[PDB]
Design a protein around this nucleic acid. Sequence first.
RNA 1: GCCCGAAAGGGUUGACCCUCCCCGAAGGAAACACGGGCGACCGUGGAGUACGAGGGGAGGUGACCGGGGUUGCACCGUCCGU
RNA 2: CGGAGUAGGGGGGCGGUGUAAGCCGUCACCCGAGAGGGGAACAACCCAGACCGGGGUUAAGGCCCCAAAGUGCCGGCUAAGUGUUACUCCAAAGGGUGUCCCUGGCCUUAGACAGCGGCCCGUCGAGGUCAGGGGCCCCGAAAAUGGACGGGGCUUAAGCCGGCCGCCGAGACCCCGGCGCACGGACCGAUUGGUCC
Lengths: 63, 142, 171, 183, 74, 86
Amino acid sequence: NIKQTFIKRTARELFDRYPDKFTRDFEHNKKMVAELTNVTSKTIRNRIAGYITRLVRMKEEGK
Amino acid sequence: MRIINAEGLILGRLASKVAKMLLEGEEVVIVNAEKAIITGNREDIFAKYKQRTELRTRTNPRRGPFYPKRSDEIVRRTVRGMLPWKTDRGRKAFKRLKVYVGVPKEFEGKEFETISEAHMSRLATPKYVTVGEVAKFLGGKF
Amino acid sequence: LRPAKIDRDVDKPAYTRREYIRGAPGPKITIFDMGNLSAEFEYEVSLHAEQAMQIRQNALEAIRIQVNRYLQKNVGRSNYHFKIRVYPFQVLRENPMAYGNGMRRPFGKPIGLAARVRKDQKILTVWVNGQHLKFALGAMHRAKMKLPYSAYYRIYDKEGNDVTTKVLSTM
Amino acid sequence: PVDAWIREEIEIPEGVEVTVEGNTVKVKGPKGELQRELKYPGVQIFTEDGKVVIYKEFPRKKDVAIVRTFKAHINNMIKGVTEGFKYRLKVVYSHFPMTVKVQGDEVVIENFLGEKNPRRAKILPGVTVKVKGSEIEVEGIDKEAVGQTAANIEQATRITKWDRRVFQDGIYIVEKAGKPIKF
Amino acid sequence: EVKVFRVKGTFERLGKKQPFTKEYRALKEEHVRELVYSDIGSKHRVPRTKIWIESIEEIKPEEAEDPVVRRLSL
Amino acid sequence: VRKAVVLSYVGSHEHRDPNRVILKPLDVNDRGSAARLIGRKVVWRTPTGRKLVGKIVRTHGTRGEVKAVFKPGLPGQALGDYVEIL
RNA sequence: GCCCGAAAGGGUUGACCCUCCCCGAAGGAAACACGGGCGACCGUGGAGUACGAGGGGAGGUGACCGGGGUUGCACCGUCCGU
RNA sequence: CGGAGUAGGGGGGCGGUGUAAGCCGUCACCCGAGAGGGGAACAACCCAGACCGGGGUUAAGGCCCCAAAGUGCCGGCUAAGUGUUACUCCAAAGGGUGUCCCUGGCCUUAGACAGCGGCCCGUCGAGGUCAGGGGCCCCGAAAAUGGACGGGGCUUAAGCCGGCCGCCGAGACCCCGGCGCACGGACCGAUUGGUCC
């Protein structure tokens, strides 16, 4: 089935293009993914949203 | 054109991504060049860059390697190193790039892209220096 | 004389037979047992070679003199049975070239002597009682310094069993 | 590693207010207020009800050393805003008495070894110097600046050209933060 | 239930054998085995063939001799 | 318009095949299912409007690229250009 | 890409291009559904399907193709005899 | 029975000699007399032996950009740009409370520093102290035109250790179609043969 490499790559490109509309909130991230992306699957969209949430967590914090 | 803010980005990774963009065919602008970082020890980094700047042809200095002293030119030169520079294809791809220190009034009023693969946060060892500090050590204007 | 890295290794055939070697030299070493010889000591401290080796009689004699002077100044002849176990039987040769004829008819004339030793082989031994293990180890170190390759020391009891760790822990 | 969750704790005294603003420590007390930036990857400084707590959740030796160092620095800040620090210097000479005087942000020393030129030491802001004959006092609110001022007053008198078994003139520290210097 | 295991064995480096005893937290012993392999390989540069395990026996949290595991288990 | 970018010729670092080409589709859905284009025709336009026609053969890698055959092959003036899928 | 192209070469008894249909070597997917694995991934079904070098056939528009000279891009290539 | 060419060999492994480089032999894999795919380029190191046009799968090796394919996964180490070197073509004896591990003894509820008080107690009252061995790194470590991990550059790596999962990549291997050669055969020529199987 659909692999996580595709998800991480697409989420990484979305975040790169728009690092101003994505936040630490899972549901707002879902909504903004649905808005700014032309995907046609809740599975793919929600996975992208989760990975974007992790991205924001990391880019805010840092070791 | 794709405008990228360099604040808090690792130089070589930024340059790799930008070079691949250029070869695929996009126009790229980079702002805030002085705020990208280089990891490692201050003295080793400074020594390397000084050695670079002191390279010259012994029979004619009007010829010879011209390694930069400015931050924007340093970034540009890293990118150029990451391209095929002895071909028309790479010459065009490199012509398609522009780098700026700060954010000039022209670009003032826009939202800037970033790069995830390149960001100061993937690091864990605090040893790091700034390109602006390198430029100051070398004696260049900004 | 010539550096010892020339004679260190053991890659050449054995050359130990004097009824055929013309002009071979005598040894510069005559004493191999020092101290007290009939005193039945407790601890036996023995050196061991880390890899195969070829030791010059010069090095052997220097080791002897230094270690014996140390043990005399510190322990006393009444103690410390000191023994060297290996004898120099190899003959070393040098090509007589340096008017000259270079590499014409190169077969060396004899110059000196050396002892051959294999891996994990005993070279010398100090027999001593408990109250002088410090000086026995000092002698081990001094001898270690004057050797072409590296060596390790071990300790043995009566019945010849290894008690090195137990004796090293408790000083 | 060494342990799991290394954690050090400091008890806050009478009227000392301790605050964190992300990597800085603000310390207010009866006298003065101090700030200091302390950061290391993985070390967290946060305030409980009445405690300063320094934490790292899987540490090595160097992290342990970092933590203990930060604890010592915070304790110094607290003690400083509570009481203060006081260093002491002693003046000695064999021939050519020299005069030490305070001029604004500088201490000036004249007639050292008979030189026609004066030596100068820089006083840092927040420190006060008092000269009463052969004894000098550096009083202040922060230990680093106080010790640095004292060290500058000392290093303004150092010789390199003649044997010091015979040429011994100068100014010397005798008491660090209430701790005599002994050989 | 998360179990505490104790591992005993020997490893050989440069022709010299050396015994070892360790303690781990895990659900099974296969995880423990993989972790032991990886850790000894890293810290002493030993391949898996030169590592021999004799015993992976389950113990209780309070009869242990490792501070990290002891604090993680209380 | 259901288009893709021409990236490179096929081969290794030292040699190349000039009748085969690597294509990157731009739509995220086609990139997620690039194998559902195997067998499709794909066209490139020349500066004079002429048409060169090729065919998508199989997948290339795991990121979402595809391989295409173009006999008669493409010129080097088409390596960072757009191509239209049918 | 620009230029030449009468004859000796093909071609209105149809050049080139377009659309659909049948067979098909070696080889050979994917979406999706159910499970194993910390994980990168994998297994089962879809499926020997879609596709596939070539081999054949049906309908449309109607005039060049092959060849030659020079040049542009990509990659390769350190002369001949002894 | 007839016609020759060869009487300077070299790389790689083994042996005698030699300070060594080299000299002399030996084996008979390679170059010579051997295309193609890799090692940055390399006569002989790795894959692999070549009629022509095509379609596929692998090998050596590789997957941050140059450059086709992973900014791949799990556990750990290094802070010195150490390193980023299978070989061709890489500095040691001796040292290091630098860090990560293993083992074996000795003290412990008042121990091992400092301290109130001249082997003693009231307090700082919780674990500490000696020996061996291993991994990585550091010191030891100086050269001449300006400069070499192939370059850019890289620090929970784009390095190292122990393992794993996918992909890219030859004229090698599989497949379709064409040319020739060797051997055998059938039929057929007004001379050294021809058509086909």
